[PDB]
Design a protein around this nucleic acid. Structure first.
Lengths: 94, 187, 95, 105, 81, 80, 108, 96
DNA sequence: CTGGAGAATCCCGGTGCCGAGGCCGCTCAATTGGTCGTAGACAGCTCTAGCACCGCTTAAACGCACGTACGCGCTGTCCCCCGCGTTTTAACCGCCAAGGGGATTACTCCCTAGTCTCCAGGCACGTGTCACATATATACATCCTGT
């Protein structure tokens, strides 16, 4: 099937790591689904504009990292950058 | 078993106004300071430095929050200043120093006509068995500036060491230039 | 001069000129000292520092226009630090 | 054989997050590790928010994250309140706080 | 560099307040203004430098400041070229 | 029609109670109705522009979410 | 071939439709731009430019100046009810502000 | 070896000279006049972009451009902009 | 400060409803494998700025001295919102049985748009300068404030 895809399978996979026994209501799961579509578009739009700033025609991981630096308040940005860079580091070795 | 040594210099400079001021009767300007001996950034481990002055001032307890830590002020008499250096880690005991504010020159230095008075002393902050955070902060200290870093007191001796180069080069340059120009114009 | 007569003159005069109100040299060192904590040895285009000043003077003038309305709120003519704080909190800067 | 997402030690979808990138007219070239980075960041924010909301609800004697506690977790965090400053979580109400002036005694 | 927030003098703040309609200023408001201005400046400067470090440049150009102001909801006209 | 009086004084008082207000002036209900009717008309006007453009006759929740994001007021929970 | 006619001219605009559409063609604002988008965008862009240049010049004349300074822009975009709205969150460099002195802070 | 940078100065002086024959414009005021054009261009194009994407469309069009002008410009500002553009599209497709 | 009533909260334990998750079964879409241009990166190299200094000039910041004007505080006065009981309007069913208005979806198809050429005006950057208006000067007009 297809019709309407969403984040629900990843908001519940990531929730089962932080709190193995905690569930999530359909409304709250929908709210998380919506929230991720916010940050995705925000980071990707700032990254597209960043590519446009240094006149690149590609959004690389460097653009995404600089877009993450521009939005997260310090500690949030300092840990999100580490998450992204570790994921990219570990994905290039496989 | 971890011991970290941080070299620092704390002192004061003073400039004589040449006459007693009529507004407040002060005769000297002075700047009291702590700065690092090495070209390193103290702010990586120092939260603030408090300077406690003599009770003649409207507020005796001054504060500074960025290196090179210093306060500029005016006065007419010498007094002891208590400098309390606080570290970023609250678990580390702050350091306490006592500096004798020197504003007047000795007879030998007065006869030499020196334009500034300086009194500064070298010390070493010793952190024995510091916390992990404090150890990381002390080890991760960066360089303060790309330029040179230097010491002043004995001010008369440093000024003489400077002039022993300065006047030599100046006289050489002057005489050589005069000779060149006169020979070239004579031809 | 009756306290408030030479100050109202200045309100009418500084609301009609367009020149910057902060001195340049003192403000440019502040913009370099603030940059200090992000990168050793950063250079600034002259126009970049001018744009920073054009940002900050406008921001402070807007904040002093919103702070005056709060002073007039408590039947005051003096703007008090809690006025800047109320304006800014209602601004969401330090909610 | 192996989802691109799995080859990062993650739970989030590196594969679909690539398609959403290079379909939304952001640029003309999504790199190899642009979606691998964006997916990691998205999963990170989800981890943070989900943990906070989840045991805020479990602080409420609940075993099911409810949007009320989504709002509580977001509004109590100083970093997530800056991020989601202009976002109204529906059916999340507000935060309990009584101005001292109003309060009696 | 050191102690440059003091480069914003009492007259420097009073003139800015006069342009904003303020007639009488208090004693402590000068320090409040310094704090507010310091926070705003630090945020804008940080965001501008984010465009320089990413660009591998050593000089902060005008476009970086313009974009930093735009991200802050402070679109500025006059430095667009 | 004029059914802006459906937002009644008790309702405005409940919205004030939720907002921490613990005492409300008499003329605060005829103010709040003018403040709420301007906010509604703005978000509806934008939701009807997103609905005319899609050549649809019913204002869907997606139109309301898009029009609310246009104002800056961002709401989480209705598919956007 | 035929004498080439531009796109600003056929429509009847001053702002460059070629350059406008051009920023759009390689601007990723979309994926396949049509044949009316740049025309409409340039038309409205330059319409607002004219709308403002009007008020700016009129205020300038009020100041007995023949050259529009940024002041003739702050004063204008704040003097007009809808330009201010459109440019509400926009600071105009070297423009100043309008002399709005609160009534309660006056001589009594 | 030239480094030429584009701007809107040439067409803001055509429009200004035409809508104010006796009035000039300073270089610093033309910088503002340029930034204003680029800003509104960004706004209208971005709103048309979003408009097209909301309807699952890969192309930003002049119909989306008109709806974005309806969303962006306030009431009158809108009306005039929409009318000007609408009439400019029927003067262009009539091969004048 | 204790009393003593009288209302509110506030967890404990109980009892069903129904959403949240459990699984199953195919559809969409992300992976795999491979050829084909090329994004940008990196290695020079031209040449603007940026930076850094130094002098002379003077506006300006600043400290001080002195009243005046404005700011927290008190209290009294009077009304207008709070609390709470009664009258009134809104608003659910049951009773009444389905059309139809309209999103949702495809299959054709013709028109619009990308792609990719080769020209040719027109937009940029010079250069060649002309001149608004900034700075300066003075009387005219308010425009005060102390008598």
């Amino acid at each position: 099937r297809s019709r309407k895809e969403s984040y629900s399978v990843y908001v519940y996979k990531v929730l089962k790591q932080v709190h193995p026994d905690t569930g999530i209501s359909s409304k709250a799961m929908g709210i998380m689904n919506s929230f991720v579509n916010d940050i995705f578009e925000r980071i990707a739009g700032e990254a597209s504009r960043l590519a446009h700033y240094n006149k690149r025609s590609t959004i690389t991981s460097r653009e995404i990292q600089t877009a993450v630096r521009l939005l997260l308040p310090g500690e949030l940005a300092k840990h999100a950058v580490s998450e992204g860079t570790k994921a990219v580091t570990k994905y290039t070795s496989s | 078993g971890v011991t970290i040594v941080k070299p620092i210099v704390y002192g004061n400079v003073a400039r004589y106004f040449g006459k007693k001021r009529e507004e407040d009767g002060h005769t000297h300007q002075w700047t009291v300071y702590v700065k690092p001996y090495r070209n390193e950034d103290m702010s990586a481990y120092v939260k603030k430095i408090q300077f406690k002055l003599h009770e003649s001032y409207g507020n005796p307890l001054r504060v500074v929050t960025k290196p090179p830590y210093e306060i500029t002020e005016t006065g007419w008499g010498e007094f002891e200043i208590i400098i309390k250096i606080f570290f970023i880690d609250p678990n580390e005991r702050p350091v306490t120093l006592y500096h004798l504010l020197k504003l007047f020159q000795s007879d030998t230095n007065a006869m030499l006509g020196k334009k500034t008075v300086v009194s500064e002393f070298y010390d070493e902050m010793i952190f024995q068995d510091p916390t992990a955070m404090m150890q990381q902060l002390l080890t991760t200290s960066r360089q303060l500036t790309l330029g040179a870093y230097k010491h002043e007191t004995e001010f008369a001796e440093l000024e003489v060491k400077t002039r022993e180069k300065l006047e030599a080069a100046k006289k050489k340059t002057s005489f050589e230039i005069a000779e060149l120009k006169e020979r070239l114009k004579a031809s | 001069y009756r306290p408030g007569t030479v100050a109202l003159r200045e309100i009418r005069r500084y609301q009609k000129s367009t020149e910057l109100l902060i001195r340049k040299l003192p403000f440019q060192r502040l913009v370099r000292e603030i940059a200090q904590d992000f990168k050793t040895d950063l250079r600034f285009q002259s126009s970049a520092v001018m744009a920073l000043q054009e940002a900050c003077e406008a921001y402070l003038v807007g904040l002093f226009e919103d702070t005056n309305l709060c002073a007039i709120h408590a039947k005051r003519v003096t703007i008090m630090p809690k006025d800047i704080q109320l304006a800014r909190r209602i601004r969401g800067e330090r909610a | 054989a192996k989802s691109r997402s799995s080859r990062a030690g993650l739970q989030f979808p590196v594969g679909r997050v690539h398609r959403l990138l290079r379909k939304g007219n952001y640029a003309e070239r999504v790199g190899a590790g642009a979606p691998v980075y964006l997916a990691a960041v998205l999963e990170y924010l989800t981890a943070e928010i989900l943990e906070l909301a989840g045991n805020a609800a479990r602080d409420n004697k609940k075993t099911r994250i409810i949007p009320r506690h989504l709002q509580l977790a977001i509004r109590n965090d100083e970093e997530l309140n800056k991020l989601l400053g202009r976002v109204t979580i529906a059916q999340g109400g507000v935060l309990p706080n009584i101005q001292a002036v109003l309060l009696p005694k | 560099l050191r102690d440059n927030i003091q480069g914003i003098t009492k007259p420097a703040i009073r003139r800015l307040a006069r342009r904003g309609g303020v007639k009488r200023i208090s004693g402590l408001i000068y320090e409040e203004t310094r704090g507010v201005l310091k926070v705003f400046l630090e945020n804008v400067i940080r965001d501008a430098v984010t465009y320089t470090e990413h660009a591998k440049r050593k000089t902060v150009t005008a476009m970086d400041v313009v974009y930093a102001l735009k991200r802050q909801g402070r679109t500025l006209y006059g430095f667009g070229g």
